């Protein structure tokens, strides 16, 4: 039989320290040593700890684990924003032969600082205008919380037709990224001398604009 | 980590059979024994094949699966939308007793037609380099199952730091969009001869490249 248990959550302040326990039987951790994973959804689970309590290259200090009889605990100190994320533990069953892995567990960063986005306005490239296309990118980036409005300007009058926007989504270091494209001829890219992306994120708003072409 | 590459989206009609392969060394897979995972976005992955073959007690029948040396693979003969989660597989014994997982596949049973994503690179402007930095935007959209994987050079070497990849989202058009950006300094850029963004979606791979050719 089955899984190793671990509590659904944890949860934590910045620079404080959180911890996550492993439950298991005398077949896998009682006997066999532990391993412990951070899973981003849609990456692949990442090895953090290894033979209980080692630390794999590239692992930081602040994640320590041990194994007590039974169980297994894993020491995030310094709880940082982009710790929030799913951790898993796993051992070898004896009794049943195979890896048997922990429930898990998801840490909340309680109370993360508020990041207002930086704003990237990126004008038609060559390769897609001797192509004989034209699409505008306004990368949205860094940003905490993740709501954000977009809005398209152009010869200072109002984009309404051609704008596409992505619903943010966690980056690495837990703030949001997104990005707003406007689709246009390489015709209206011309024809128009200024182009501008508006973001607007908890009473704040940038402004990018872009003007065609410059430089060599 | 340096793990198991597994296509990012399979996907067929109802009832239809879909494979989703697993590649490795002759070190994991070539070699050790593969172990196959379920994981809804709910807590806990779900054992279904071990020891290459062995369908987990009480799995269902349209369960199959196969290992040849470096790859391996798992069949789902009866497609049915509750077989609409994400799907790992795992090799085991790298660094010793640790799972090494494979990327993760998400099956998706096909509610419109198949699109091979529409690539398009962004190199700095020359605004933002004038203002000191440089990041390239790789836009990604009009594709369908909504998931890819995406991967960034620098003169044929991979660039796994300082990247970041949107989250899939279903656009206007009822296809999905995605962006992947690349920070760098503006001679981190230039000292490079050229940058490509290369994109896998369920058997098509794209590849785009960039040169600093900006006031260069």
Redesign the interface.
Known sequence: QS?LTQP?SASGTPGQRVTISCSGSSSNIGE??V?W?QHL???????LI??DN?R?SGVSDRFSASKSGTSASLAISGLQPEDET?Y?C?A?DDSL???V????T?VTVLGQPKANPTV????P????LQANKA?L?C?I?DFYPGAVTVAWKADGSPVKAGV?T??P????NNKY???S?LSLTPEQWKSHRSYSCQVTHEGSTVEKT?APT???
């Open positions: 899984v659904p066999n040593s391993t994973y959804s849609g990456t692949a689970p990442k090895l290894y033979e080692s794999a799913d898993y796993a070898w032969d195979v890896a892995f922990g429930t898990g998801k990237t306005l990126f004008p490239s060559s390769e897609e699409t990118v990368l980036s596409e992505t619903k989504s966690k980056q690495s990224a997104a990005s494209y872009v410059e430089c060599s």
